[model samples]
Target: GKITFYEDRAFQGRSYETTTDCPNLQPYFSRCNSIRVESGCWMLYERPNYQGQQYLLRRGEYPDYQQWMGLSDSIRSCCLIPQTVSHRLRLYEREDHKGLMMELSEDCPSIQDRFHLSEIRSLHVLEGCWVLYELPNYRGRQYLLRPQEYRRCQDWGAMDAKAGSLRRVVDLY
Candidate 1:
């Protein structure tokens, strides 16, 4: 995987390139305004150590933060998401494996429409990675969910149990 971060919009100013996960990119550049994903999918974090808001990106050219629906230009850390062929996810209405449960292998544009839920307390990513959006149609804040079990919303760095949409992480257009 390869990605290049530019300090100015439209691939201008200073730049830094990487092919692997970076816990901290501050020392390499002061600010990030544009990006070019050459190969593989990536999740950009707003804070260091993969904390704060997340933006899922694929092989493409993002001239500025707005194209990626970023809330700001502060991209402190990033992780390269692995390519996968299948996806499996389970949503829970309550914490610790209790309450309503729903399994999905395809993209859910509106969780409320499919599961009739506006908030999910816990989740389990079984087969592949996925991204959860705070609003339907993949809008609002984003959270990257790898193959693991989250007993509560905080496990995924969310302050509340609000999830409006879900999408699998695959390398595709």
Candidate 2:
């Protein structure tokens, strides 16, 4: 007996097993209509049909991580619809078992210019609660500060203010 793709739309939301006969059907050919069985295998067809992208998160494995990075680049090359504009490429540290947030942006920015990978900033702690504080002069302008739960230091808001000032200020008096 040849095995072909069989859909059972009749068993929608039901757990019943039945068989059908297709005598004229080719040995390797499968037939699918609009209304077919609710097979869990529909994901296989749906991904290609919709050109959806899938991401898998896992603990850091150096060699495998390199491969995964390459695959991510390849997927983007296909120009398929992205689930999110910012594709988060998180790497979990085995020592502390925490996620290291990474970002892949379409914008043309140097890797060093990116927030997560920059050496000037610390990446030890993961972001917990992000607070958006509005500035006085810059009405409708707000700054983001994330103070992770594990952080012992306070005054993240102050640090953000200083950083913002540095970016805007030309001369220091």
Candidate 3:
């Protein structure tokens, strides 16, 4: 993904460009007043090292930081969203893909109702992209799961063990 960060709003002033993931981008500029996603989807973090609130951006031009519904003008880190397609996921009752499993190829609006499990300790993403919500009905912190196996909750960057919902992420649309 390629994006241009502007020091001044309305796409004017000193700018920094990048086409790859940057976990700590403070050195490039003290602030990101504006941005333009030249290609691909991306997630911009509010804090450095990919921490804090994340704002998703598709291929588009954001003349100012307000366009992203941002509360502040500072952008710390960024990650490119992989353009892959698949809808295969397996939720495990225990870690390392062990114990009872629930396979899903479609969106599960309420994971708690489908399996009545208290928590999902691990999971195996066979294919496609999936979003794990912290609360039911797609609310709370969102964890994007790519095609791979998550040995434990920590693997997904989650300190909580509850999984409220799941949805396939085929494209931005």
Q: State residue 89's C-alpha deviation in candidate 2, in Å.
A: 2.4
Model 3 lDDT, full chain set: 0.76
Candidate number that wins on lDDT, 1 or 2: 1
Over 33-112, each residue of candidate 3 has an lDDT whose tens digit, in order, gives 78888887676767776666555565889888778556566677877776676689999988978899889999888887
- Encode model 1's per-residue lDDT on 1-173: one tens digit a residue: 78999979999888899989998988887567889999888888888877887777778999986787777787788898878878999998889878888899999999999888989899999888999999999988888888998888888778788899998888743
Using lDDT as the measure, the top candidate is 1
What TM-score against the true fold does each predicted structure earn? 0.93, 0.15, 0.70
Candidate 3 segments exceeding 4 Å error: 4-16, 29-39, 46-55, 58-75
Q: Which lDDT values do the candidates have, in the order given?
A: 0.85, 0.22, 0.76
Clashing pairs in 1: none
Clashes per candidate, residues 3 or more apart or on different chains: 0, 5, 1
**Candidate no. 3 TM-score:** 0.70
Q: In model 2, which runs have C-alpha deviations exceeding 4 angstroms?
A: 1-83, 99-173
What's the true lDDT of residue 101 in model 3? Answer: 88
Winner on TM-score between 1 and 2 is 1
Global Cα lDDT for candidate 2: 0.22
| Model with the higher TM-score, candidate 2 or 3 | 3
Task: Output the worst ten-in-a-row residue range by lDDT, candidate 2.
Answer: 164-173
- Give the per-residue lDDT digits (tens) of candidate 2, residues 57-162: 1122222313323222111100111122121122222213244544221221223334423211221224222222122222111222222322211222223211
